[PDB]
Structures are given as C-alpha cells and as structure tokens.
C-alpha cells in the first residue's frame, strides 16, 4: 500500500522496503558545482529507430508506455555503459504545481516533471533478473519545464482520458520516443536505484542536462489522471515524485565541461 499520500508516502516506504535507507538511493540532488567532468565518458548512443511501442497502462502510481523488448529494437549504449540496454518502458513523475514534480533536482531546483526511459542490460536475459544486479538497468532521465508545447508528447496526452484510472490500459502502437528528447545529449551520471518500491539499487542513472518544454495544457492533462480505480473516490494523480535522497559515498560525473 505504498503511494504518495498523506500516510503512505516516501517517508514511510522504509518500513516495508528497508533499502529505502540504503547506500545508493535515488533520486539525488545534482550539485553542478561539485559534479566533475569525466573525460573517460562517451557520448550516449540512443538507438530508437526500430522501437515498437505496444500499450499504455495506468498502474496506480504513474502510467507506463510499454515497448517490445524481446529483440534489440530500441537500445541505449555508450556513455557510462558497458553492453546493450533495451528500452522496456517510459513513464513520468509530475507535480500539482509547476514549481515541483521532478525527482532529481539541479542545485536544489525542482522541475515541473521528469521523464524516465527505463532500459535493462541484455546480458541478464530479462527485466526481472536485471533488477537483481547492480548494473542491471540504465534509466535516461529528462527534466520537463512548462513553456512551449512538446509536439512529440501530444499523442501521449491525448490517450490519457482512456486510461484515467488505475488498471486501465490502451493500445499504444507506433509511438516514437525520439520525439521526447531535447537537442543535446549532455548528461550527468551516477549509480543509484529505482525511485519506487522495491527501490532496488540496480540503476546506472543518466540525467540529461537540457530540459524539454511542455505546455501548461499538456501538464494540466497529466494532472487529470487518477491514482484510484474506476468507481472509487477520485484522487488526482499528482505529486508522484520521491524527494532527493542522500548522496552518501557516490560521485556524480558530467559528460560535458
Ligand atoms: Zn520513474
């Protein structure tokens, strides 16, 4: 019964998921004055030309756009990564107000939302095995600010009415995740965790420096989703973000000077 409410939110998760207080928890604050350029880093390779989206699902915590991950169709490689990481899904975290919603922060700044493109390391065969490994996942995180509309997000926005409540899904084929990227692939990276229970410390985070802009109308439609199931009292799906966790014995590295 974890969530983001009044009595089940992030500050409670440790009782069921003690790794919530672990050594490598996410998100974190990215201090641009202490992150250090790492010349050993390579450019990201984002290879999404062959992506096969399938479905969009309201899981009661966010919505996931799911992909066919049974072949190397949409992969992330390079950067800090060794090997090939396959896209399984993306989802967002967002606020009730434009001044909060992101999970990572940058010099303590909160963005309106954050996109997570989740990938798993093909050496482990499937997602469920990958999450048991320290290098099992690679999550590309992208900040959202409110300003101009993001045209490539609109197809997501316009299906949201069909998945208003927890447990609803809809077909979502032929969606191109390249339309969600900023111009630059400059990034910060560090080792961390899933940001929802079970909070497993299996993630290489790659957080892009350049945010994307979305419109106030686009974010307002996200805020019409519901945490609840159909036929239950309405609870708007807002503020589904975990706050920054202690960095502990980690360093954040930058791909750029
Ligand atoms: Zn996430």
PDB file of C-alpha atoms and ligand atoms in Angstrom:
ATOM      1  CA  UNK A   1       0.000   0.000   0.000  1.00  0.00           C
ATOM      2  CA  UNK A   2       2.806   2.435  -0.690  1.00  0.00           C
ATOM      3  CA  UNK A   3       1.997   5.667  -2.501  1.00  0.00           C
ATOM      4  CA  UNK A   4       2.373   9.389  -2.377  1.00  0.00           C
ATOM      5  CA  UNK A   5      -0.376  10.303   0.075  1.00  0.00           C
ATOM      6  CA  UNK A   6      -0.873  11.643   3.340  1.00  0.00           C
ATOM      7  CA  UNK A   7       0.088   8.362   5.319  1.00  0.00           C
ATOM      8  CA  UNK A   8       1.806   6.153   2.747  1.00  0.00           C
ATOM      9  CA  UNK A   9       4.271   8.461   1.042  1.00  0.00           C
ATOM     10  CA  UNK A  10       8.032   8.334   0.585  1.00  0.00           C
ATOM     11  CA  UNK A  11       8.832   8.953   4.221  1.00  0.00           C
ATOM     12  CA  UNK A  12       7.007   5.674   5.084  1.00  0.00           C
ATOM     13  CA  UNK A  13       8.439   3.390   2.430  1.00  0.00           C
ATOM     14  CA  UNK A  14      11.349   2.244   4.603  1.00  0.00           C
ATOM     15  CA  UNK A  15       9.023   0.218   6.840  1.00  0.00           C
ATOM     16  CA  UNK A  16       8.243  -2.222   4.030  1.00  0.00           C
ATOM     17  CA  UNK A  17      11.373  -1.600   1.919  1.00  0.00           C
ATOM     18  CA  UNK A  18      14.284  -1.074   4.291  1.00  0.00           C
ATOM     19  CA  UNK A  19      16.659  -0.379   1.360  1.00  0.00           C
ATOM     20  CA  UNK A  20      14.882   2.969   1.203  1.00  0.00           C
ATOM     21  CA  UNK A  21      17.618   3.999   3.681  1.00  0.00           C
ATOM     22  CA  UNK A  22      20.388   2.318   1.657  1.00  0.00           C
ATOM     23  CA  UNK A  23      23.710   3.452   0.265  1.00  0.00           C
ATOM     24  CA  UNK A  24      22.714   4.048  -3.332  1.00  0.00           C
ATOM     25  CA  UNK A  25      19.211   5.504  -3.309  1.00  0.00           C
ATOM     26  CA  UNK A  26      17.670   7.746  -5.961  1.00  0.00           C
ATOM     27  CA  UNK A  27      16.827  10.432  -6.792  1.00  0.00           C
ATOM     28  CA  UNK A  28      19.578  12.803  -5.673  1.00  0.00           C
ATOM     29  CA  UNK A  29      20.318  16.472  -5.916  1.00  0.00           C
ATOM     30  CA  UNK A  30      22.807  17.205  -8.722  1.00  0.00           C
ATOM     31  CA  UNK A  31      25.179  19.909  -7.486  1.00  0.00           C
ATOM     32  CA  UNK A  32      26.650  21.429 -10.663  1.00  0.00           C
ATOM     33  CA  UNK A  33      29.464  22.884  -8.578  1.00  0.00           C
ATOM     34  CA  UNK A  34      30.708  19.510  -7.365  1.00  0.00           C
ATOM     35  CA  UNK A  35      29.868  17.132 -10.282  1.00  0.00           C
ATOM     36  CA  UNK A  36      33.104  16.644 -12.173  1.00  0.00           C
ATOM     37  CA  UNK A  37      33.700  16.273 -15.881  1.00  0.00           C
ATOM     38  CA  UNK A  38      34.863  12.765 -16.696  1.00  0.00           C
ATOM     39  CA  UNK A  39      36.875  12.507 -19.933  1.00  0.00           C
ATOM     40  CA  UNK A  40      36.643   8.588 -19.680  1.00  0.00           C
ATOM     41  CA  UNK A  41      32.797   9.083 -20.579  1.00  0.00           C
ATOM     42  CA  UNK A  42      31.440   8.615 -24.098  1.00  0.00           C
ATOM     43  CA  UNK A  43      28.688  10.062 -25.990  1.00  0.00           C
ATOM     44  CA  UNK A  44      25.411   8.441 -25.446  1.00  0.00           C
ATOM     45  CA  UNK A  45      24.143   6.264 -28.227  1.00  0.00           C
ATOM     46  CA  UNK A  46      20.349   6.377 -28.273  1.00  0.00           C
ATOM     47  CA  UNK A  47      19.157   3.949 -30.996  1.00  0.00           C
ATOM     48  CA  UNK A  48      15.365   4.177 -31.137  1.00  0.00           C
ATOM     49  CA  UNK A  49      14.696   3.958 -34.912  1.00  0.00           C
ATOM     50  CA  UNK A  50      13.281   0.403 -34.628  1.00  0.00           C
ATOM     51  CA  UNK A  51      11.235   0.984 -31.420  1.00  0.00           C
ATOM     52  CA  UNK A  52       7.942  -0.870 -31.108  1.00  0.00           C
ATOM     53  CA  UNK A  53       5.627   0.686 -28.596  1.00  0.00           C
ATOM     54  CA  UNK A  54       2.719  -1.578 -27.579  1.00  0.00           C
ATOM     55  CA  UNK A  55       0.497  -0.253 -24.821  1.00  0.00           C
ATOM     56  CA  UNK A  56      -0.025   2.435 -22.192  1.00  0.00           C
ATOM     57  CA  UNK A  57      -1.027   1.437 -18.686  1.00  0.00           C
ATOM     58  CA  UNK A  58      -2.165   3.397 -15.619  1.00  0.00           C
ATOM     59  CA  UNK A  59      -0.561   1.396 -12.788  1.00  0.00           C
ATOM     60  CA  UNK A  60      -1.943   3.492  -9.925  1.00  0.00           C
ATOM     61  CA  UNK A  61       1.418   5.290  -9.416  1.00  0.00           C
ATOM     62  CA  UNK A  62       2.113   6.684 -12.885  1.00  0.00           C
ATOM     63  CA  UNK A  63       1.483   5.474 -16.443  1.00  0.00           C
ATOM     64  CA  UNK A  64       3.891   3.330 -18.428  1.00  0.00           C
ATOM     65  CA  UNK A  65       4.316   3.354 -22.206  1.00  0.00           C
ATOM     66  CA  UNK A  66       5.495  -0.165 -22.872  1.00  0.00           C
ATOM     67  CA  UNK A  67       7.757  -1.464 -25.620  1.00  0.00           C
ATOM     68  CA  UNK A  68       8.610  -4.780 -27.257  1.00  0.00           C
ATOM     69  CA  UNK A  69      11.887  -5.705 -25.526  1.00  0.00           C
ATOM     70  CA  UNK A  70      12.185  -9.223 -26.985  1.00  0.00           C
ATOM     71  CA  UNK A  71      14.753  -8.025 -29.568  1.00  0.00           C
ATOM     72  CA  UNK A  72      17.306  -5.123 -29.788  1.00  0.00           C
ATOM     73  CA  UNK A  73      14.799  -2.667 -31.236  1.00  0.00           C
ATOM     74  CA  UNK A  74      15.285   0.440 -29.020  1.00  0.00           C
ATOM     75  CA  UNK A  75      18.606   0.391 -27.219  1.00  0.00           C
ATOM     76  CA  UNK A  76      20.852   2.586 -25.183  1.00  0.00           C
ATOM     77  CA  UNK A  77      24.615   2.110 -25.320  1.00  0.00           C
ATOM     78  CA  UNK A  78      27.712   4.169 -24.690  1.00  0.00           C
ATOM     79  CA  UNK A  79      28.077   6.859 -22.176  1.00  0.00           C
ATOM     80  CA  UNK A  80      28.996   5.198 -18.919  1.00  0.00           C
ATOM     81  CA  UNK A  81      27.517   1.883 -20.005  1.00  0.00           C
ATOM     82  CA  UNK A  82      29.134  -1.377 -20.985  1.00  0.00           C
ATOM     83  CA  UNK A  83      26.975  -3.532 -23.258  1.00  0.00           C
ATOM     84  CA  UNK A  84      23.465  -3.048 -24.578  1.00  0.00           C
ATOM     85  CA  UNK A  85      20.427  -1.865 -22.669  1.00  0.00           C
ATOM     86  CA  UNK A  86      16.936  -2.422 -24.118  1.00  0.00           C
ATOM     87  CA  UNK A  87      14.041   0.017 -23.677  1.00  0.00           C
ATOM     88  CA  UNK A  88      11.202  -1.641 -21.750  1.00  0.00           C
ATOM     89  CA  UNK A  89       9.027   1.374 -20.855  1.00  0.00           C
ATOM     90  CA  UNK A  90       8.925   5.046 -20.131  1.00  0.00           C
ATOM     91  CA  UNK A  91       6.923   6.960 -17.535  1.00  0.00           C
ATOM     92  CA  UNK A  92       6.850  10.334 -15.812  1.00  0.00           C
ATOM     93  CA  UNK A  93       6.719  11.918 -12.405  1.00  0.00           C
ATOM     94  CA  UNK A  94       4.996  15.269 -12.059  1.00  0.00           C
ATOM     95  CA  UNK A  95       3.674  17.853  -9.629  1.00  0.00           C
ATOM     96  CA  UNK A  96       0.436  19.516  -8.640  1.00  0.00           C
ATOM     97  CA  UNK A  97       2.201  22.914  -9.293  1.00  0.00           C
ATOM     98  CA  UNK A  98       4.651  23.917 -11.921  1.00  0.00           C
ATOM     99  CA  UNK A  99       7.391  24.502  -9.351  1.00  0.00           C
ATOM    100  CA  UNK A 100       7.627  20.826  -8.257  1.00  0.00           C
ATOM    101  CA  UNK A 101       7.340  17.365  -9.791  1.00  0.00           C
ATOM    102  CA  UNK A 102      10.834  16.256 -10.649  1.00  0.00           C
ATOM    103  CA  UNK A 103      12.641  13.584  -8.654  1.00  0.00           C
ATOM    104  CA  UNK A 104      16.211  14.657  -9.357  1.00  0.00           C
ATOM    105  CA  UNK A 105      16.966  18.309  -8.636  1.00  0.00           C
ATOM    106  CA  UNK A 106      19.718  20.517 -10.053  1.00  0.00           C
ATOM    107  CA  UNK A 107      21.299  22.812  -7.461  1.00  0.00           C
ATOM    108  CA  UNK A 108      18.140  22.169  -5.458  1.00  0.00           C
ATOM    109  CA  UNK A 109      15.888  23.321  -8.377  1.00  0.00           C
ATOM    110  CA  UNK A 110      12.777  21.234  -8.932  1.00  0.00           C
ATOM    111  CA  UNK A 111      11.386  20.907 -12.420  1.00  0.00           C
ATOM    112  CA  UNK A 112       7.692  20.509 -13.252  1.00  0.00           C
ATOM    113  CA  UNK A 113       8.152  16.838 -14.170  1.00  0.00           C
ATOM    114  CA  UNK A 114      10.711  14.182 -15.053  1.00  0.00           C
ATOM    115  CA  UNK A 115      10.664  11.515 -17.782  1.00  0.00           C
ATOM    116  CA  UNK A 116      12.270   8.157 -17.138  1.00  0.00           C
ATOM    117  CA  UNK A 117      13.158   5.916 -20.108  1.00  0.00           C
ATOM    118  CA  UNK A 118      13.895   2.553 -18.492  1.00  0.00           C
ATOM    119  CA  UNK A 119      16.314   0.099 -20.092  1.00  0.00           C
ATOM    120  CA  UNK A 120      17.668  -3.293 -18.949  1.00  0.00           C
ATOM    121  CA  UNK A 121      21.036  -4.923 -19.599  1.00  0.00           C
ATOM    122  CA  UNK A 122      20.636  -7.694 -22.135  1.00  0.00           C
ATOM    123  CA  UNK A 123      23.337  -9.807 -20.504  1.00  0.00           C
ATOM    124  CA  UNK A 124      20.802 -10.669 -17.817  1.00  0.00           C
ATOM    125  CA  UNK A 125      18.192 -12.066 -20.182  1.00  0.00           C
ATOM    126  CA  UNK A 126      15.055 -10.431 -18.758  1.00  0.00           C
ATOM    127  CA  UNK A 127      13.977  -7.421 -16.704  1.00  0.00           C
ATOM    128  CA  UNK A 128      13.264  -9.383 -13.597  1.00  0.00           C
ATOM    129  CA  UNK A 129      16.780 -10.801 -13.482  1.00  0.00           C
ATOM    130  CA  UNK A 130      18.300  -7.425 -14.404  1.00  0.00           C
ATOM    131  CA  UNK A 131      16.815  -5.620 -11.415  1.00  0.00           C
ATOM    132  CA  UNK A 132      18.751  -8.048  -9.127  1.00  0.00           C
ATOM    133  CA  UNK A 133      22.085  -6.786 -10.484  1.00  0.00           C
ATOM    134  CA  UNK A 134      23.999  -3.588  -9.672  1.00  0.00           C
ATOM    135  CA  UNK A 135      24.384  -2.871 -13.383  1.00  0.00           C
ATOM    136  CA  UNK A 136      21.008  -4.229 -14.439  1.00  0.00           C
ATOM    137  CA  UNK A 137      19.253  -1.071 -15.534  1.00  0.00           C
ATOM    138  CA  UNK A 138      20.028   2.209 -17.279  1.00  0.00           C
ATOM    139  CA  UNK A 139      17.490   4.997 -16.844  1.00  0.00           C
ATOM    140  CA  UNK A 140      17.622   8.046 -19.046  1.00  0.00           C
ATOM    141  CA  UNK A 141      16.099  10.920 -17.104  1.00  0.00           C
ATOM    142  CA  UNK A 142      14.867  14.076 -18.762  1.00  0.00           C
ATOM    143  CA  UNK A 143      13.534  17.156 -16.994  1.00  0.00           C
ATOM    144  CA  UNK A 144      10.337  18.904 -18.097  1.00  0.00           C
ATOM    145  CA  UNK A 145       9.679  22.633 -17.672  1.00  0.00           C
ATOM    146  CA  UNK A 146       6.435  24.408 -18.548  1.00  0.00           C
ATOM    147  CA  UNK A 147       6.695  26.700 -21.568  1.00  0.00           C
ATOM    148  CA  UNK A 148       6.142  25.815 -25.228  1.00  0.00           C
ATOM    149  CA  UNK A 149       4.304  22.575 -26.093  1.00  0.00           C
ATOM    150  CA  UNK A 150       6.277  19.468 -26.900  1.00  0.00           C
ATOM    151  CA  UNK A 151       4.715  18.178 -30.115  1.00  0.00           C
ATOM    152  CA  UNK A 152       6.109  14.717 -29.693  1.00  0.00           C
ATOM    153  CA  UNK A 153       4.291  14.380 -26.305  1.00  0.00           C
ATOM    154  CA  UNK A 154       0.835  15.198 -27.648  1.00  0.00           C
ATOM    155  CA  UNK A 155      -0.049  11.628 -28.692  1.00  0.00           C
ATOM    156  CA  UNK A 156       0.573  10.593 -25.049  1.00  0.00           C
ATOM    157  CA  UNK A 157      -1.538  13.447 -23.735  1.00  0.00           C
ATOM    158  CA  UNK A 158      -4.425  12.603 -25.983  1.00  0.00           C
ATOM    159  CA  UNK A 159      -4.724   8.987 -24.814  1.00  0.00           C
ATOM    160  CA  UNK A 160      -4.780   9.841 -21.142  1.00  0.00           C
ATOM    161  CA  UNK A 161      -8.558  10.050 -20.955  1.00  0.00           C
ATOM    162  CA  UNK A 162      -8.707   6.423 -21.937  1.00  0.00           C
ATOM    163  CA  UNK A 163      -6.546   5.355 -19.006  1.00  0.00           C
ATOM    164  CA  UNK A 164      -7.849   7.682 -16.347  1.00  0.00           C
ATOM    165  CA  UNK A 165      -7.918   5.179 -13.536  1.00  0.00           C
ATOM    166  CA  UNK A 166      -5.702   2.530 -12.060  1.00  0.00           C
ATOM    167  CA  UNK A 167      -5.588  -0.690 -14.044  1.00  0.00           C
ATOM    168  CA  UNK A 168      -6.740   0.733 -17.334  1.00  0.00           C
ATOM    169  CA  UNK A 169      -4.664   0.205 -20.429  1.00  0.00           C
ATOM    170  CA  UNK A 170      -4.928   1.132 -24.128  1.00  0.00           C
ATOM    171  CA  UNK A 171      -3.220   0.153 -27.300  1.00  0.00           C
ATOM    172  CA  UNK A 172      -0.309   2.497 -27.976  1.00  0.00           C
ATOM    173  CA  UNK A 173       1.475   1.345 -31.097  1.00  0.00           C
ATOM    174  CA  UNK A 174       3.748   3.289 -33.387  1.00  0.00           C
ATOM    175  CA  UNK A 175       4.877   5.892 -30.831  1.00  0.00           C
ATOM    176  CA  UNK A 176       8.304   7.339 -31.452  1.00  0.00           C
ATOM    177  CA  UNK A 177      10.164   8.136 -28.193  1.00  0.00           C
ATOM    178  CA  UNK A 178      12.697  10.266 -30.133  1.00  0.00           C
ATOM    179  CA  UNK A 179      10.085  12.975 -30.034  1.00  0.00           C
ATOM    180  CA  UNK A 180      10.625  13.288 -26.275  1.00  0.00           C
ATOM    181  CA  UNK A 181      14.325  14.128 -26.391  1.00  0.00           C
ATOM    182  CA  UNK A 182      15.982  17.557 -26.088  1.00  0.00           C
ATOM    183  CA  UNK A 183      18.566  18.696 -28.641  1.00  0.00           C
ATOM    184  CA  UNK A 184      21.629  17.907 -26.564  1.00  0.00           C
ATOM    185  CA  UNK A 185      22.576  14.568 -25.058  1.00  0.00           C
ATOM    186  CA  UNK A 186      24.970  16.099 -22.497  1.00  0.00           C
ATOM    187  CA  UNK A 187      24.399  14.295 -19.219  1.00  0.00           C
ATOM    188  CA  UNK A 188      25.248  13.618 -15.615  1.00  0.00           C
ATOM    189  CA  UNK A 189      25.629  10.011 -14.390  1.00  0.00           C
ATOM    190  CA  UNK A 190      25.796   8.225 -11.070  1.00  0.00           C
ATOM    191  CA  UNK A 191      24.900   4.814  -9.589  1.00  0.00           C
ATOM    192  CA  UNK A 192      21.535   4.556  -7.894  1.00  0.00           C
ATOM    193  CA  UNK A 193      18.177   2.894  -7.519  1.00  0.00           C
ATOM    194  CA  UNK A 194      14.627   2.582  -8.672  1.00  0.00           C
ATOM    195  CA  UNK A 195      12.678   5.564  -7.295  1.00  0.00           C
ATOM    196  CA  UNK A 196       9.613   3.497  -6.429  1.00  0.00           C
ATOM    197  CA  UNK A 197       9.340   0.343  -4.295  1.00  0.00           C
ATOM    198  CA  UNK A 198      11.121  -2.063  -4.367  1.00  0.00           C
ATOM    199  CA  UNK A 199      13.809   0.687  -4.564  1.00  0.00           C
ATOM    200  CA  UNK A 200      16.430  -1.769  -5.832  1.00  0.00           C
ATOM    201  CA  UNK A 201      19.962  -0.454  -6.281  1.00  0.00           C
ATOM    202  CA  UNK A 202      20.299  -1.638  -9.848  1.00  0.00           C
ATOM    203  CA  UNK A 203      20.367   1.589 -11.884  1.00  0.00           C
ATOM    204  CA  UNK A 204      23.018   3.481 -13.826  1.00  0.00           C
ATOM    205  CA  UNK A 205      21.358   6.927 -13.978  1.00  0.00           C
ATOM    206  CA  UNK A 206      21.930   9.121 -16.999  1.00  0.00           C
ATOM    207  CA  UNK A 207      20.253  12.508 -16.448  1.00  0.00           C
ATOM    208  CA  UNK A 208      20.211  14.897 -19.336  1.00  0.00           C
ATOM    209  CA  UNK A 209      21.348  18.467 -18.697  1.00  0.00           C
ATOM    210  CA  UNK A 210      18.898  20.094 -21.179  1.00  0.00           C
ATOM    211  CA  UNK A 211      15.218  20.013 -20.177  1.00  0.00           C
ATOM    212  CA  UNK A 212      12.352  19.686 -22.625  1.00  0.00           C
ATOM    213  CA  UNK A 213       9.471  22.183 -22.584  1.00  0.00           C
ATOM    214  CA  UNK A 214       5.840  21.141 -22.347  1.00  0.00           C
ATOM    215  CA  UNK A 215       2.809  23.402 -22.358  1.00  0.00           C
ATOM    216  CA  UNK A 216       0.651  24.294 -19.435  1.00  0.00           C
ATOM    217  CA  UNK A 217      -2.216  22.436 -21.241  1.00  0.00           C
ATOM    218  CA  UNK A 218      -0.136  19.294 -21.575  1.00  0.00           C
ATOM    219  CA  UNK A 219       0.767  19.249 -17.860  1.00  0.00           C
ATOM    220  CA  UNK A 220      -2.818  20.035 -16.880  1.00  0.00           C
ATOM    221  CA  UNK A 221      -3.941  16.852 -18.686  1.00  0.00           C
ATOM    222  CA  UNK A 222      -1.421  14.780 -16.752  1.00  0.00           C
ATOM    223  CA  UNK A 223      -2.971  16.216 -13.562  1.00  0.00           C
ATOM    224  CA  UNK A 224      -6.420  14.836 -14.553  1.00  0.00           C
ATOM    225  CA  UNK A 225      -5.235  11.250 -14.162  1.00  0.00           C
ATOM    226  CA  UNK A 226      -6.330   9.320 -11.106  1.00  0.00           C
ATOM    227  CA  UNK A 227      -4.462   7.184  -8.599  1.00  0.00           C
ATOM    228  CA  UNK A 228      -7.725   5.394  -7.789  1.00  0.00           C
ATOM    229  CA  UNK A 229      -9.549   2.688  -9.654  1.00  0.00           C
ATOM    230  CA  UNK A 230     -12.819   3.272 -11.547  1.00  0.00           C
ATOM    231  CA  UNK A 231     -15.758   3.594  -9.208  1.00  0.00           C
ATOM    232  CA  UNK A 232     -13.669   4.811  -6.369  1.00  0.00           C
ATOM    233  CA  UNK A 233     -13.369   8.288  -4.874  1.00  0.00           C
ATOM    234  CA  UNK A 234     -11.298  10.464  -7.084  1.00  0.00           C
ATOM    235  CA  UNK A 235      -7.692  11.086  -6.076  1.00  0.00           C
ATOM    236  CA  UNK A 236      -5.805  13.063  -8.645  1.00  0.00           C
ATOM    237  CA  UNK A 237      -2.525  11.536  -9.795  1.00  0.00           C
ATOM    238  CA  UNK A 238      -0.228  14.440  -8.873  1.00  0.00           C
ATOM    239  CA  UNK A 239       2.929  14.753  -6.832  1.00  0.00           C
ATOM    240  CA  UNK A 240       4.020  11.212  -7.692  1.00  0.00           C
ATOM    241  CA  UNK A 241       7.692  12.013  -7.063  1.00  0.00           C
ATOM    242  CA  UNK A 242      10.177  10.841  -4.447  1.00  0.00           C
ATOM    243  CA  UNK A 243      12.356  13.659  -2.997  1.00  0.00           C
ATOM    244  CA  UNK A 244      16.160  13.708  -3.168  1.00  0.00           C
ATOM    245  CA  UNK A 245      17.998  11.146  -1.086  1.00  0.00           C
ATOM    246  CA  UNK A 246      21.464  11.394   0.486  1.00  0.00           C
ATOM    247  CA  UNK A 247      24.305  11.026  -1.946  1.00  0.00           C
ATOM    248  CA  UNK A 248      26.486   9.140   0.561  1.00  0.00           C
ATOM    249  CA  UNK A 249      29.593   7.566  -0.887  1.00  0.00           C
ATOM    250  CA  UNK A 250      28.886   8.450  -4.549  1.00  0.00           C
ATOM    251  CA  UNK A 251      30.161  10.915  -7.100  1.00  0.00           C
ATOM    252  CA  UNK A 252      28.148  12.460  -9.907  1.00  0.00           C
ATOM    253  CA  UNK A 253      30.130  12.678 -13.169  1.00  0.00           C
ATOM    254  CA  UNK A 254      29.430  15.016 -16.077  1.00  0.00           C
ATOM    255  CA  UNK A 255      29.848  14.219 -19.743  1.00  0.00           C
ATOM    256  CA  UNK A 256      30.455  17.926 -20.556  1.00  0.00           C
ATOM    257  CA  UNK A 257      32.626  20.797 -19.390  1.00  0.00           C
TER     258      UNK A 257
HETATM  259 ZN1  LIG B   1      10.486   6.947 -12.581  1.00  0.00          ZN
END
